[PDB]
Design a binder for this molecule. Structure first.
Ligand SMILES: *[C@@H]1O[C@H](CO)[C@@H](O[C@@H]2O[C@H](CO)[C@@H](O[C@@H]3O[C@H](CO[C@H]4O[C@H](CO)[C@@H](O)[C@H](O)[C@@H]4O)[C@@H](O)[C@H](O[C@H]4O[C@H](CO)[C@@H](O)[C@H](O)[C@@H]4O)[C@@H]3O)[C@H](O)[C@H]2NC(C)=O)[C@H](O)[C@H]1NC(C)=O
Ligand SMILES: *[C@@H]1O[C@H](CO)[C@@H](O[C@@H]2O[C@H](CO)[C@@H](O[C@@H]3O[C@H](CO[C@H]4O[C@H](CO)[C@@H](O)[C@H](O)[C@@H]4O)[C@@H](O)[C@H](O[C@H]4O[C@H](CO)[C@@H](O)[C@H](O)[C@@H]4O)[C@@H]3O)[C@H](O)[C@H]2NC(C)=O)[C@H](O)[C@H]1NC(C)=O
Ligand SMILES: *[C@@H]1O[C@H](CO)[C@@H](O[C@@H]2O[C@H](CO)[C@@H](O[C@@H]3O[C@H](CO[C@H]4O[C@H](CO)[C@@H](O)[C@H](O)[C@@H]4O)[C@@H](O)[C@H](O[C@H]4O[C@H](CO)[C@@H](O)[C@H](O)[C@@H]4O)[C@@H]3O)[C@H](O)[C@H]2NC(C)=O)[C@H](O)[C@H]1NC(C)=O
Ligand SMILES: *[C@@H]1O[C@H](CO)[C@@H](O[C@@H]2O[C@H](CO)[C@@H](O[C@@H]3O[C@H](CO)[C@@H](O)[C@H](O[C@H]4O[C@H](CO)[C@@H](O)[C@H](O)[C@@H]4O)[C@@H]3O)[C@H](O)[C@H]2NC(C)=O)[C@H](O)[C@H]1NC(C)=O
Ligand SMILES: *[C@@H]1O[C@H](CO)[C@@H](O[C@@H]2O[C@H](CO)[C@@H](O[C@@H]3O[C@H](CO)[C@@H](O)[C@H](O[C@H]4O[C@H](CO)[C@@H](O)[C@H](O)[C@@H]4O)[C@@H]3O)[C@H](O)[C@H]2NC(C)=O)[C@H](O)[C@H]1NC(C)=O
Ligand SMILES: *[C@@H]1O[C@H](CO)[C@@H](O[C@@H]2O[C@H](CO)[C@@H](O[C@@H]3O[C@H](CO)[C@@H](O)[C@H](O[C@H]4O[C@H](CO)[C@@H](O)[C@H](O)[C@@H]4O)[C@@H]3O)[C@H](O)[C@H]2NC(C)=O)[C@H](O)[C@H]1NC(C)=O
Ligand SMILES: *[C@@H]1O[C@H](CO)[C@@H](O[C@@H]2O[C@H](CO)[C@@H](O)[C@H](O)[C@H]2NC(C)=O)[C@H](O)[C@H]1NC(C)=O
Ligand SMILES: *[C@@H]1O[C@H](CO)[C@@H](O[C@@H]2O[C@H](CO)[C@@H](O)[C@H](O)[C@H]2NC(C)=O)[C@H](O)[C@H]1NC(C)=O
Ligand SMILES: *[C@@H]1O[C@H](CO)[C@@H](O[C@@H]2O[C@H](CO)[C@@H](O)[C@H](O)[C@H]2NC(C)=O)[C@H](O)[C@H]1NC(C)=O
Ligand SMILES: *[C@@H]1O[C@H](CO)[C@@H](O)[C@H](O)[C@H]1NC(C)=O
Ligand SMILES: *[C@@H]1O[C@H](CO)[C@@H](O)[C@H](O)[C@H]1NC(C)=O
Ligand SMILES: *[C@@H]1O[C@H](CO)[C@@H](O)[C@H](O)[C@H]1NC(C)=O
Lengths: 107, 113, 120, 235, 121, 113, 235, 113, 235
């Protein structure tokens, strides 16, 4: 089964900062990979559809890249509404796998 | 308005086509100065915006199943066209009915004076 | 908008069995399959199970670390789902969710509020 | 036969009893019959399973259909299989047939077996795709990439030069069928399962270098599991 | 344990042609990499090589005789054959079929035919 | 609006077709599990209601005669279609003329207010 | 080319200068090109008259046309005729040609004669019907049922397993042509006229039973009129 | 609306066709009694009225050039038709748009009362 | 692909973004795909230039297209050319191919040369016209008249029995290629340029009459310039 990791385990940030997240995995020919985030007291919410297509109602700031074992999440700038933790997953078929996540620490 | 089968959809679409509008040089119109027989191909990439690529695969499977029977019913050997016939029925479904405004057809624009 | 709600949660004694459940509306069951996932501060999110659409003859899957400790069920006239835990052993204290989504995306695009289920 | 319709940026099924003009076919160039690669559904590519997917029927005649240009395939196949009595099996391709344009790894097979029936046929009915013509039957030689077809209404040398993996077949079309990889005029490795084209490609680390290389009057088969290579494990 | 059986053409005129054959009644010959072949011993002479045949569809010949020698097989009957153009007195010999015996490493052949002979007149 | 030739019409119509909507099992979509090559045929019976069967024979003879010349004029070898072309002219006879109401065409429904 | 039109529950001729919408072609599946059996017009089925209806022309090339499924034929024919010098006469059928689906009594003929011309052709221009393709020319072997074709606008094993009557031909395509019935490797009976397939079928009351049955080193011909059977009237 | 290339146009048009309406005798419908295979041809003459013949040659050259690429894009071997497809697009360019009067289409006759 | 349109008694180009109903296609019988003779553009008819216009390519497959009946050609060609090793060069014509209906002077050529490539092809891409089918490739034997094709929207034995000029080729498809006229089993006259079919036809004033006529065991070539005839100037 495909294994996956994420880094940095957390990132300290400032408002309007450009950020990115590394996610790595056993190789995946599928671009099925996707990203989501959650807040304390909140159910997870999808950020991007598989590969790079953004989830509906997601701000233009969001972006991402890659295929196979290496891919990433990017955000052009940050808003305080984006505080939370972030994840990525393998939806290539089954069993599903998920990253340990990251934390959006504040400066 | 369909959803994916248990199979796993690869959202990527990497494809090739024979289309090539225009010609690089006037001699390229000529097969004698034309590209090698494999040179006709061109390629491009699409992504699963709005679920379209994956939706396409499911649609394709259903279409393939429907098509299999039709082909059994054909008598012609290489079935070079179908879409032309489909275009004809696209029109037939829209035409030969009575149609001023009252019928639910012909997309008549609202009436001005 | 999915109208999903969750039920059957809370503390239970170890060695038991329970049918954790969900209900939803505004997204017909005829167009999808569903997943259960779980989360803990010690684990992060993890997949638990997959429930296929009847076109797949309701085939199911479970994470191998939990497989055979749970079964699933669904009712497409009631729009309801069951985790049908076979056991209530230990370490099952993570928050439970049930998800669904567009087949041309993935099931992550809908989730419950989640529920707490715990073991003594 | 239903047609895909793109409207409101989503697919819709054409089979409705009202054709609302919101979808318009301004020209025939909005029509497409594009082929799709079966492989894009996650279908296994092990050669033994490919064999499992072919019916070996005799009876009803073959048919083909014209289709629109479509996606690249990572895996495709060429076939030389013949009947055990040395009879040719499967018809030569018809005029205008040529191999699929973009296969990354055409797999070539040769050898013999019962090769039951006369027209093969896909057990799932999946199309064989030769160039721009889908087929219900396998043709000799040239590459066919398994796929399906769909019809929708619209609103560098490595791209074909790549190709590796040629191997022998032992038996054909039956459960008993077996395959052996061939390099350097050496028949070897059972290729049982789980081998990506790259998994097999890296095995050429032994060619003229780290192993095998039967510098004898004949070639030796190694039975795959150096443990994998199974050097000197030939019998 | 294979009952390999010799077979072949009868007496022929020199300048003639010859067909030779054998069969593996004890074995299907369906194992991949099986090698079978021919050799001859004129006048009590040593094992002159004639030809090799592989189950994997590979053929080899003794180049000195190759211009007049051809390999054929019929697997459905476990048969192997030779065709010889221009048979003459220099071609009179005992003849034998052969098969790999250890099987799959260093040829190891090895297993032998009953023996037959050919003469001309 | 035609009548029968001196030949003798048999009013019975016993016929066969290749049409078969749907499939008995999902595997029947697949030629591999498909019916024997003659199994595609289905059959039925019709009777000369309103003189239709006999009328059909006469019509067929006339059509055959007209067709013979057309085929002589064709250049294509197996003439796999014609009806598609006829459908096109069905439409062309009804379209590209001016047409509000005054022209004798387009079946415009009476106008309401 | 006129099309039948069904309207007001009657046939109407499409060739008018006004196409009133009372007839509507909602889809292409209302169209039909159905074949019709010539036999349904009461046309004689005696084999000698069938021969009289074929032209034996050389010259203009053959053509075929696709047509819709159609009525059963009681009588149909298979042909092996060759030129007197042993030349083959008439082309082998083209790919996709097969015999008509429902003939009750396919008649088979073999033998030789001048077999003038190269493409035969029907003297009335009637179509030969092979499976789903009408033809202007006779193909070797496989069954052709004489018929015509019409185009109209719409608003168990015995069904093909039946078949009797195989016979020899003496001469071909000419007034002098003659036929002899064959059973049990015996050539007999001139088949002159007036014989239904059942009339001939009942003649098998003699086979291995009531007559004929030349238990000799050769076969004897009987000249039809026991008076009919013409037993021992062979010369 | 085109003009001639430096080539030299011969204004004469002498041509032949396979068309022959009707039949001289009823047997002429029948290929058996039909004309010799070359007898199908008929012929006629046209003159460059209004520059039409010469215009035709230039148009033909341009069409030939456009056609060459299209044929390269075809997958079918003998391309027996094209005009039928063109007829379909003739209709498609005129239909499926909204169309009462306001749109620049359907040639609606002026409205009377 | 643009279509000619006849309106206001003039040609108009169909490729506009508005299709005004002033042009109407009441039926499909207004459509035409007529062929045009390349010769009608004043293109040279010297046989050496005809050779200059052919590409001799190998590679991409041949294609043909159906077209409407069209204008007479004064000059057309038949070809028997073969490779120097006696290999056949250029494919036999496909079924249904026959020579153009009205050529006044079919020119026939035979002989050998390198005959490079396998499919010929016209260097300008001009169509070869066989009967009613345009081609991108030259077929063996039968006449092809160089031409183009256009599509427009519409609002006695000598006609084919004429034909003269058969000659040998020396080399083929290359600058070095040369031709010699042949009459009475005599190879003669280089045919370099400037010779109308009538210019050549009048040279038969010598046949069995005023000159040449090698009444010997072999035939003599005369080198064209009696000065023209080059009698006795053979070497
Ligand atoms: C459109 O897309 C759908 C998928 O969305 C395709 O559906 C597939 O259909 C095939 C059959 O048509 C299914 O294959 C079936 O799988 C069964 C299970 O195999 C598994 O289980 C075994 C045993 O444990 C494992 O070893 C193996 O790894 C698998 O996990 C088989 O039991 C079935 O076989 C029986 O029936 C077939 C068909 O007659 C016989 O050939 C067999 O011999 C046997 O009798 C069968 O193979 C497949 O699972 C479906 N997948 C999905 C996702 O639905 C459609 O095929 C496709 N449409 C077209 C026209 O191609
Ligand atoms: C559509 O349907 C009509 C019927 O409705 C068919 O019409 C038939 O047409 C054929 C000719 O095309 C007719 O056949 C002719 O019959 C004449 C009389 O034969 C009879 O008389 C003799 C002598 O007494 C009797 O022995 C015999 O039993 C018959 O009673 C013949 O004299 C004609 O022959 C002459 O012309 C033909 C044609 O060139 C030559 O071949 C002959 O050698 C000879 O020169 C001829 O055979 C038939 O009678 C018509 N029947 C009807 C009912 O009209 C059409 O054929 C059909 N359309 C198509 C296209 O198939
Ligand atoms: C539609 O109609 C137009 C005309 O209206 C045609 O156009 C012709 O196009 C060809 C090329 O496609 C032209 O031919 C060119 O002529 C050049 C000059 O040749 C002359 O000059 C030499 C040297 O002085 C004289 O000996 C000779 O007698 C001529 O006077 C050549 O130099 C060109 O050759 C170079 O390019 C060609 C093409 O690659 C090579 O084959 C040659 O080897 C060389 O490299 C060339 O031959 C012609 O002049 C054009 N005529 C006109 C009137 O425009 C189109 O061809 C036609 N459309 C189609 C598709 O057929
Ligand atoms: C395992 O390793 C061996 C090396 O140990 C490797 O053999 C190599 O194969 C390549 C390709 O056959 C050889 O390079 C070729 O040399 C010839 C002659 O100069 C060229 O004509 C070839 O070019 C053609 O093929 C190319 C690749 O498709 C095309 O790009 C090109 O356009 C031509 O069509 C090619 O350059 C090389 O010399 C050998 N080397 C040795 C030492 O064997 C073998 O391929 C490996 N096994 C596998 C299965 O990959
Ligand atoms: C005149 O009478 C004789 C009998 O005196 C009669 O001969 C009979 O012919 C039938 C059919 O050939 C024979 O029965 C056959 O037996 C074989 C062998 O077992 C079967 O394979 C045959 O079955 C095939 O054909 C059937 C009929 O088409 C199919 O229904 C079936 O699916 C098979 O394809 C068949 O049963 C019978 O044994 C002989 N009997 C004798 C004594 O000759 C002859 O047919 C009569 N003449 C004519 C022209 O009818
Ligand atoms: C140069 O002059 C010589 C005469 O000095 C000339 O030879 C003549 O050729 C014609 C045609 O071949 C000969 O007439 C022919 O005779 C035969 C036999 O009777 C006929 O079958 C021929 O008729 C066929 O061909 C005709 C023309 O195509 C058709 O109209 C007809 O339907 C037939 O198909 C034809 O009449 C004549 O006898 C000779 N005369 C001599 C003395 O040679 C030669 O043709 C001239 N050279 C060239 C190239 O024109
Ligand atoms: C290949 O398959 C056949 C049949 O699938 C095997 O023979 C069958 O073996 C089973 C037991 O596994 C028996 O119950 C059947 O009676 C046998 N006959 C059949 C069903 O064909 C055979 O053993 C297999 N051998 C290999 C190595 O492929
Ligand atoms: C077969 O037919 C030919 C011609 O139809 C017969 O020969 C003709 O016989 C008639 C008298 O009936 C003569 O007037 C003709 O001069 C003969 N020649 C012709 C017209 O070909 C011949 O007798 C017939 N024979 C048989 C038994 O069929
Ligand atoms: C035929 O053509 C070739 C090439 O067109 C001639 O050889 C060339 O001659 C030119 C001088 O005219 C040299 O500059 C080239 O180097 C030669 N090689 C080439 C370009 O192929 C040859 O002389 C010609 N001969 C005849 C009689 O046709
Ligand atoms: C492989 O064997 C064949 C004979 O089967 C021989 O022709 C060829 O030279 C061999 N390959 C190499 C690269 O030596
Ligand atoms: C009829 O004769 C043929 C030889 O012409 C022979 O092969 C066959 O056995 C005979 N038929 C029967 C049923 O004896
Ligand atoms: C011309 O020569 C051929 C042999 O090449 C010969 O058959 C023929 O009779 C000769 N032509 C004439 C008219 O003598």
């Amino acid at each position: 089964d495909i294994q996956m990791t994420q880094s940095p385990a957390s990132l300290s940030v400032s408002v309007g900062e450009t950020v990115s997240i590394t996610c790595r995995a056993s190789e995946n020919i599928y671009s099925s990979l996707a990203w989501y985030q959650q807040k304390q007291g909140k159910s997870p919410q999808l950020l991007v559809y598989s590969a790079t297509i953004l989830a509906d109602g997601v701000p233009s700031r969001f972006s991402g890249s890659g295929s196979g074992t290496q891919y990433s999440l990017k955000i052009n700038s940050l808003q305080s509404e984006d505080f939370g933790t972030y994840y990525c997953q393998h939806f290539w078929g089954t069993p599903y796998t998920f990253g340990g996540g990251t934390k959006l620490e504040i400066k | 308005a369909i959803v994916n089968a248990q199979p796993k959809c690869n959202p990527n679409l990497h494809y090739w086509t024979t289309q090539d509008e225009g010609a690089a040089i006037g001699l390229a119109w000529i097969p004698y100065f034309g590209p090698a027989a494999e040179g006709i191909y061109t390629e491009g990439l699409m992504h699963n915006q709005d679920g379209l690529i994956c939706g396409l695969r499911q649609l394709a499977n259903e279409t393939t199943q429907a098509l299999q029977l039709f082909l059994r019913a054909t008598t012609e050997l290489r079935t070079f066209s179908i879409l032309n016939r489909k275009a004809i029925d696209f029109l037939l479904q829209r035409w030969g009915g009575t149609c001023h405004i009252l019928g639910p057809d012909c997309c008549i624009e609202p009436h001005d004076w | 908008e999915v109208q999903l709600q969750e039920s059957g949660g809370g503390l239970m004694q170890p060695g038991g069995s329970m049918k954790l459940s969900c209900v939803a509306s505004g997204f017909t069951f005829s167009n999808y399959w569903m997943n259960w996932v779980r989360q803990s501060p010690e684990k992060g999110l993890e997949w638990v199970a997959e429930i296929r659409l009847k076109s797949n003859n309701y085939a199911t899957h479970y994470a191998e670390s939990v497989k055979g400790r749970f079964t699933i069920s669904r009712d497409d006239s009631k729009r309801s789902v069951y985790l049908q835990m076979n056991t209530l052993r230990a370490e099952d204290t993570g928050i439970y969710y049930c998800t669904r989504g567009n087949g041309n995306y993935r099931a992550m695009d809908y989730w419950g509020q989640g529920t707490s289920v715990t073991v003594s | 036969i239903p047609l895909g319709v793109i409207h409101n940026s989503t697919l819709q099924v054409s089979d409705v009893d009202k054709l609302v003009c919101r979808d318009k076919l301004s020209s025939t160039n909005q029509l497409r019959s594009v082929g799709l690669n079966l492989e894009g559904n996650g279908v296994a590519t092990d050669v033994p399973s490919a064999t499992k997917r072919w019916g070996f029927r005799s009876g009803v005649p073959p048919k083909v259909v014209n289709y629109e240009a479509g996606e690249w395939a990572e895996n495709c196949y060429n076939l030389e299989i013949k009947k055990p009595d040395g009879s040719e099996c499967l018809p030569a391709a018809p005029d205008g047939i040529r191999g699929f344009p973009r296969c990354r790894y055409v797999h070539k097979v040769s050898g013999t077996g019962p090769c039951a029936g006369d027209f093969a046929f896909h057990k799932e009915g999946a199309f064989f795709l030769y160039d721009r013509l889908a087929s219900t039957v396998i043709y000799r030689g040239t590459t066919f990439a398994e796929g399906v077809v769909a019809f929708l209404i619209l609103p560098p040398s490595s791209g074909y030069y790549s190709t590796t993996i040629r191997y022998q077949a032992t038996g054909f079309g039956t459960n008993e069928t077996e395959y052996l990889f061939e390099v350097d005029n050496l028949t070897y490795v059972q290729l049982e399962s789980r081998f990506t084209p790259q998994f097999l490609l890296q095995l050429n680390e032994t060619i003229y270098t780290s192993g095998k290389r039967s510098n004898t009057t004949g070639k030796l088969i190694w039975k795959v599991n150096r443990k994998i290579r199974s050097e000197e494990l030939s019998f | 344990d294979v009952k390999l059986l010799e077979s072949g053409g009868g007496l022929v005129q020199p300048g003639g042609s010859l067909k030779l054959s054998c069969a593996a009644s004890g074995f299907s010959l369906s194992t991949s990499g099986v090698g079978v072949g021919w050799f001859r011993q004129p006048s009590g002479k040593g094992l002159e090589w004639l030809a090799l045949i592989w189950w994997d569809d590979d053929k080899y010949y003794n180049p000195s005789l190759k211009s007049q020698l051809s390999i054929s097989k019929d697997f459905s009957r476990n048969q192997v054959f030779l065709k010889i153009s221009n048979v003459d007195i220099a071609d009179t010999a005992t003849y034998y079929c052969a098969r790999r015996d250890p099987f799959g490493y260093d040829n190891a052949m090895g297993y032998w035919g009953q023996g037959t002979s050919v003469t001309v007149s």
